[PDB]
A = this chain, B = another copy of it.
Amino acid sequence: SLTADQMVSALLDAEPPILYSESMMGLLTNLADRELVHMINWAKRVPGFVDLTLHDQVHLLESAWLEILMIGLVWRSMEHPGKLLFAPNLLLDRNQGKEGMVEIFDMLLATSSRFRMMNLQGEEFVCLKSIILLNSGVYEEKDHIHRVLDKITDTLIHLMAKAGLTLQQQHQRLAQLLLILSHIRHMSNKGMEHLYSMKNVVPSYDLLLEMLDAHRLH
């Protein structure tokens, strides 16, 4: 029932903290592992997410977590051309990423470049992250997921109309942003292949369920 403005405010307020790094792959794995609980706290504040069953919340997180870590990384790195800001004390260039790592590193750098070129705004970024969370695992509960996604679409169009875009420019920018989500899914698929080529790769159902911190009256 939130207005578009209330939805943006809710998502901006829900943003996770930026964590610091504590051998490169052990540092990156540990950082991702610590980002996960913050991602779950964020997910619980995306309007509509907690109306799903806990089972469905876990299945959406299992499908979206890697895309969500990647989009956050690309967002943090936008203002750092040619580098990836994993953490404020962990800025890497592609030379440090040099088997199979540099290909994904370049895919992420290219996303960051695209966001910088489109002048992606924070209010649009938090809508896109929310769409990843609700859409990556979708293919009563589905009806609700689709209603949330429709509300996020409305909210994106609202932000672009507020910025003064014509209707044509609004639908063109909406499409440009949603096409970037297909590239984020592609990078997550390649990134999973890369992680399975090296290695406990995905968070277990029970780990995610524990972090969701279920209510005590079942």
Known: A181-B179, A193-B193. A172 touches B150 (CB 8 A): yes
Q: Contact check, B107 vs A182: say whether CB atoms are below 8 A apart.
A: no
| Measured CA separation A167–B193 after assembly (Å) | 41
- Interface residue A175 (Cβ < 8 Å from any Cβ of B): yes
Q: Which residues of B contact A171 (CB under 8 A)?
A: 153-154, 157, 170-171, 174
- Interface residue A178 (Cβ < 8 Å from any Cβ of B): yes
Q: Which residues of B contact A186 (CB under 8 A)?
A: 136, 139, 185, 189
| Measured CA separation A8–B168 after assembly (Å) | 18
Q: Contact check, B176 vs A175: say whether CB atoms are below 8 A apart.
A: no
- Interface residue A190 (Cβ < 8 Å from any Cβ of B): yes
Q: Which of A148-203 contact B (CB under 8 A)?
A: 149-150, 153-154, 156-157, 167-168, 170-172, 174-176, 178-179, 181-186, 189-190, 193
Known: A167-B167, A175-B174. A182 touches B150 (CB 8 A): no
User: Could you tell me the dominant secondary structure of chain A's interface residues?
Assistant: helix
Q: Which residues of B contact A179 (CB under 8 A)?
A: 131, 135, 149, 178, 181
Residue-wise interface mask of A (115-152) relative to B, using a CB-CB cutoff of 8 A (1 in contact, 0 not): 00000000000000001000110010000001001100
List residues of A whose CB falls within 8 A of some B CB.
Answer: 107, 110-111, 114, 131, 135-136, 139, 146, 149-150, 153-154, 156-157, 167-168, 170-172, 174-176, 178-179, 181-186, 189-190, 193
**Other CB < 8 Å A-B pairs besides A153-B171, A153-B175, 13 of them?**
A135-B182, A136-B186, A139-B186, A149-B175, A154-B168, A154-B171, A154-B172, A157-B171, A178-B178, A178-B181, A182-B184, A185-B185, A189-B189
- Pull 6 A–B residue pairs with CB atoms less than 8 Å apart, ordered by A: A139-B183, A154-B168, A156-B175, A171-B174, A179-B181, A189-B190
